[PDB]
């Protein structure tokens, strides 16, 4: 028995059971400030690519 409420990550496909795979992480980004107004240039870490 698997639930239908949507609070689920173990949806089983063909085969006995699903286990779990990549889960929806939040990805907390770093701080943003004057994003497209001020620009940064550097040699240690910058990469124009």
């Amino acid at each position: 028995l698997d639930p239908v409420a949507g609070n689920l990550i173990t949806a089983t496909p063909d085969g006995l059971v699903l286990l779990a795979s990549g889960i929806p992480f939040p990805d907390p980004s770093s701080v943003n400030i004057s994003d497209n107004v001020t620009l940064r240039v550097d040699e240690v870490t910058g990469d124009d690519a």
Binding site: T12, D14, G15, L16, V17
Partner: protein, 49 residues
């Protein structure tokens, strides 16, 4: 039958039932399997994986 008989309605006094047992036909489905047939003292253990 126990002895020869002439035509007539069934008479439980003459025949004899034959003691018999039974078994169970088990079909593993997705997400569950079974071990054994139980009746032979092989306990039915199921695994999920």
């Amino acid at each position: 039958a126990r002895t020869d008989l002439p035509p007539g309605p069934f008479d439980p006094a003459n025949w004899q039932e034959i003691s018999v047992e039974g078994l169970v036909e088990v079909a593993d489905s997705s997400t569950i399997d079974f071990s054994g047939d139980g009746s032979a003292s092989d306990p039915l253990t199921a695994a999920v994986k």
